[PDB]
Write a structure and sequence with these properties.
Strand content of chain B: 25-35%
Radius of gyration of chain B: 21 Å
Oligomer: heterodimer
Subcellular location (chain B): Endoplasmic reticulum lumen; Melanosome; Cytoplasm; Cell surface
CATH topology of chain A: Transcription Termination Factor Rho, Rna-binding Domain, Chain A, Domain 1
GO molecular function (chain B): ATP binding; ATP hydrolysis activity; ATP-dependent protein folding chaperone; cadherin binding; calcium ion binding; enzyme binding; heat shock protein binding; misfolded protein binding
CATH architecture of the largest domain in chain B: 2-Layer Sandwich
Family (chain B): Belongs to the heat shock protein 70 family.
CATH superfamily of the largest domain in chain B: ATPase, nucleotide binding domain
Helix content of chain B: 25-40%
Bound molecules: chloride ion, magnesium ion
Number of helices of chain B: 11
Radius of gyration of chain A: 9 Å
Protein name (chain B): Endoplasmic reticulum chaperone BiP
Catalytic activity (chain B): ATP + H2O = ADP + phosphate + H(+)
Number of domains of chain B: 3
Distance between the termini of chain B: 10 Å
Shape of chain A: globular
CATH class of chain A: Mainly Alpha
Shape of chain B: globular
Chain lengths: 41, 380
């Protein structure tokens, strides 16, 4: 699901929530943050 | 408030700390003036704890009480085939406790003590912390720490635990190849690229293929040799000179740790010198039985002694390209890590492998991982 998306799409999801991935070097970092934040949004 | 967050390369043989300020990273010299610090711990006979240069430099008849290479054990179980292999070449005692490898050493006073790998790495982190605090003129409480890409969850957690024991909140664990790429600003450029990180450290060799997609990395393929590094080149030179000295004097110095230590120190310096000179003179006053040692090493001889080891670095690179089905030409950036990458023959092998493409340059390869860590710490 998440792991299949492009980085631009992961960033799109986070931007739409007004959330930022601070000091997130790798795609896994974006995947992990979206999973943790998903029940909020 | 997390204060000034520093970047720390907690390395197998050497460690490095930097801080981001005024648009760049300052790699911080230790109190002996060195921008890298041996990942070493030892004890004086009187029971004083030495960490870093003092620990590595301390001449001893008892090598079994100097601790190093704890990174080889950190986060691993006793039954890990990697541990069972590694303990065979480590001079200090490693014992099972709590299904885990512990390190047993004499600490002075006819007392021994057993330490978890992460307690040894906490001591190294303490020294790097102190290094940073002396430069910054304030306490440091938070850090970004690097690990090898192949580290598992337990190994990453044990690294964080080393940080906790040292009084550091490790805010991010980041992979070494990614850190080196960040150092060179490769995340700030547009487009999709393939990055090959060629990392020949003091003790380990790591090749990592990274992609970048919209400023974000992915570690796609890794290979290397965990028992190939700069110390192996030094050992080839050691063997050459021990053999030469025995041929010349009839004296076999191998049983004599203090003489061996003295030679190893001078060989490390000679090796570094041969990256920029064609000859290096190794001179030790009172080397053995009060007799002096004086010999020269040419770059050609250095190359001859290590040619198989140098060439062996190209196989993992081929394996990573094959695994990813990438042409040589698909590699957009080559990032070199480790001072062994300054060895002219290693530069030439890499250049020839990649059809004359020039690697990234501008950052000391011994410092690049810390540099990247410090960049990432700079946004926290
Ligand atoms: Cl190292
Ligand atoms: Mg390293």
């Amino acid at each position: 699901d998440l792991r299949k998306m492009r980085v631009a799409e992961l960033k799109q999801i986070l931007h739409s929530w007004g959330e930022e991935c601070r000091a997130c070097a790798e795609k896994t970092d974006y995947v992990n943050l979206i999973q943790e934040l998903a029940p909020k949004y | 408030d997390v204060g000034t967050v520093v970047g720390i390369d907690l390395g197998t043989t050497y460690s490095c700390v930097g801080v981001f300020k005024n648009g760049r990273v300052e790699i911080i010299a230790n109190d002996q003036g060195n921008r890298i610090t041996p990942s070493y711990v030892a004890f004086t006979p009187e029971g004083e704890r030495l960490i870093g240069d003092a620990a590595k430099n301390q001449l001893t008849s008892n090598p079994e009480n100097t601790v190093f290479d704890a990174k080889r054990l950190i986060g691993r179980t006793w039954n890990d085939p990697s541990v069972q292999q590694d303990i065979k070449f480590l001079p200090f005692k490693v014992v099972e406790k709590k299904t885990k490898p512990y390190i047993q050493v004499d600490i002075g006073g006819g007392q021994t003590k057993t330490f978890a790998p992460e307690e040894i790495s906490a001591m190294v982190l303490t020294k790097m912390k102190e290094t940073a605090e002396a430069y910054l003129g304030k306490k440091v409480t938070h850090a970004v720490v690097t690990v090898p890409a192949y580290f598992n969850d337990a190994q990453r957690q044990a690294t964080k635990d080393a940080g906790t024991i040292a009084g550091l909140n490790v805010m991010r664990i980041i992979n070494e190849p990614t850190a080196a790429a960040i150092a060179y600003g490769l995340d700030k450029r547009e487009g999709e690229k393939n990055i090959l990180v060629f990392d020949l450290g003091g003790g380990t060799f790591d090749v990592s293929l990274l992609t970048i997609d919209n400023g974000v990395f992915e570690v796609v393929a890794t290979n290397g040799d965990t028992h190939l590094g700069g110390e192996d080149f030094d050992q080839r030179v050691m063997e050459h000179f021990i053999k030469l000295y025995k041929k010349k004097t009839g004296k076999d110095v191998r049983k004599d740790n203090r003489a061996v230590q003295k030679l190893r120190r001078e060989v490390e310096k000679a090796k570094r010198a041969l990256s920029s000179q064609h000859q290096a003179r190794i001179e030790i006053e009172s080397f053995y039985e009060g007799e002096d040692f004086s010999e020269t090493l040419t770059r050609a001889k250095f190359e001859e002694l290590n040619m198989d080891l140098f060439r062996s670095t190209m196989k993992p690179v081929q394996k990573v390209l094959e695994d990813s089905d990438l042409k040589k030409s698909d590699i957009d950036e080559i990032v070199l890590v480790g001072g062994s990458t300054r060895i002219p023959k290693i530069q030439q092998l890499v250049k020839e492998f990649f059809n004359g493409k020039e690697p990234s340059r501008g950052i000391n390869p011994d410092e690049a991982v810390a540099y990247g860590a410090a960049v990432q710490a700079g946004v926290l």
